[PDB]
């Protein structure tokens, strides 16, 4: 039951290649609590109902207080922080296949960031959904090694980003574990939605080859070395979906390739054929990623629904 | 006082180039703890002697308690926390700049990070220069918040940066719109473990190497962002063992900020041939030295050695 066989059953369970993003700010934070206080606490007493809360590791007794008296303290942030996390969770866990937090979101504010994001992943793993940090780590090996605690000890995550730039073999401390053997899943940067991804990512080559195939090669031949499907993990590639040209390449020439693809809602895309269609496979293998376009739109549950059904009104 | 006068300054009061690196691993906090057991402390009291430990701001409560710990959860915390202050009060009269790699402090959860957060605290007092090696990187409106971090929270004087996704990410890192306000960084040219050449040099452009490219696109970016006229900058990180490499960087970016590891620990000590390959008015070759210092038995011995050996060489 490596994270490739969990993703397959969650696949079924849902039908969709869905990947919502959970990116919080300073702004959806201090506006949620805004609303919410002249609401009289309305999803957060919808939270304290749900079952998993219970399970929390991190200063459980707080967050489960009632709302107003958290005004009766330094502990108030916290609290928003971590309940606007499980709120977006409660409204939209049903439409996503999977869910990615990008780390840094959660460390602007040192220790309290950290704890909400340890609650979070600990609220996503009793829900059984499958994870993905958006850590995009990279350091020699040694060091290496402690990003993978903190990722797949710590946190429980099924998988990470990964920026192998600095070398491929840093993976090896990254995907395996000797100690307890264990294989990790994660996904490394292909081709990504910044505006000027094409300096080093297009504009560099080898053998006629442009770096992010050298790149994609690379990262599987270190897949075969760990022999990570084996043992039902993987390396996959984060394809922006603005990349249509290169996306369709990689899903070519590597058939069963796992891909991770952001920047549709928020950054400007075409849903179709900015990915699913372009990258098209029993998809699962062709991740959606929308966070801002969700996580900031008034009717979250609404916005993933839409974007469910219109992904999933797809059928190619 | 920017980021260039401040490294200036303290340059020319120590005369050094070196640069003691902090990366604490859960074998050097039981080790550690396990000494300050076995021996009545007299380190850990030290610490707690010293000036500047009050200017933490994270569990001061604790912090400060003479050992003999009770609160049982808090003892990790407290012990890793004074290895730390250990090697900065051990070390800090030979060193430059402190290190400190944000890998090591974050895989117990907040706990290290609130242990990150007292260590910049406490160097910041110290006025040393300071820099977290993250190698962030991400998009536009992600890495706003690691500047955030970094440079407001943590108020470190420069990070580490992956550029790979684009040099457009240096905008939002070294320079805040909001504030006015502008931070210096360390770019990822040339890194030290064995498999680097892979992409750095088998990669190019009508036949310059992409560190080549990295290199000049992230100096571009400075003269954009008009950080040498602010007193900050954009160098670059070159491992002590890219000898050549070394050398045409220093050759053609004559006056370029560089930062150096791989000697010591890794590769084992280049031999300072590295301080020389890019040797200028000291400073602009920051030397990292890690490991060497921090797992050795005698951390101040294993200081001031490198400390004369680099001394020399400036020579
Ligand atoms: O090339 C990439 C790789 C990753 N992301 C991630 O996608 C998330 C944003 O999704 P969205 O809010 O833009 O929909 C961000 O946290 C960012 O880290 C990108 O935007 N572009
Ligand atoms: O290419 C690089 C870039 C950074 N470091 C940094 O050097 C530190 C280790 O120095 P040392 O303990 O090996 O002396 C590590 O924290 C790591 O982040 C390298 O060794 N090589």
Redesign the interface.
């Known amino acids: 039951m490596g994270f490739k066989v969990k993703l397959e059953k969650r696949r079924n369970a849902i039908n969709t290649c869905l990947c919502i993003g959970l990116?919080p700010?300073e702004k959806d934070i201090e506006n949620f609590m805004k609303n919410e206080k002249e609401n009289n606490y309305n999803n957060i007493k919808k939270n304290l109902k749900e079952k998993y809360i219970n399970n929390v590791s991190?200063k459980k007794d707080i967050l489960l207080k009632a709302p107003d008296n958290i005004i009766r303290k330094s502990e108030e942030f916290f609290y928003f922080f971590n309940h606007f996390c499980f709120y977006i969770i409660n409204e939209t866990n049903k439409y996503a296949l999977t869910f990615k937090m990008?780390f840094?979101?959660y460390?602007?504010?040192?220790?309290?960031?950290?704890?909400v994001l340890?609650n979070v992943f600990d609220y996503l793993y009793e829900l059984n959904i499958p994870t993905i940090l958006?850590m995009?780590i990279?350091?020699?090996?040694?060091?290496?090694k402690?990003?993978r605690?903190?990722i797949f000890?710590?946190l429980k995550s099924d998988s990470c980003t990964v920026?192998?730039?600095?070398?491929?073999?840093?993976l090896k401390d990254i995907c395996y574990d000797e100690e307890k053997n264990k294989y990790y899943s994660a996904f490394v940067?292909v081709k990504?939605?910044?505006?000027?991804?094409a300096?080093?990512?297009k504009?560099?080559?080898?053998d006629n080859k442009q770096?992010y195939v050298?790149?994609a090669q690379?990262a599987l031949n270190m897949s075969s070395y760990l022999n990570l499907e084996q043992n039902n993990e993987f390396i996959g590639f984060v394809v922006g979906a603005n990349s249509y040209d290169e996306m369709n390449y990689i899903r070519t020439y590597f058939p069963n390739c796992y891909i991770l693809s952001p920047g549709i809602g928020?950054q400007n895309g075409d849903l179709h054929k900015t990915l699913t269609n372009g990258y098209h496979k029993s998809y699962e293998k062709i991740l959606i990623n929308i966070g801002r376009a969700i996580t900031k739109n008034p009717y979250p549950q609404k916005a993933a629904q839409m974007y469910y059904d219109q992904i999933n009104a797809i059928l190619k």
């Open positions: 990116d700010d991190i990008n840094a979101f460390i602007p504010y040192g220790s309290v960031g950290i704890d340890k958006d995009k990279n350091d020699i090996g040694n060091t290496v402690n990003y605690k903190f000890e710590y920026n192998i730039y600095m070398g491929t073999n840093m940067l990504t939605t910044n505006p000027d991804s300096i080093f990512q504009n560099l080559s080898l770096a050298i790149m690379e928020a």
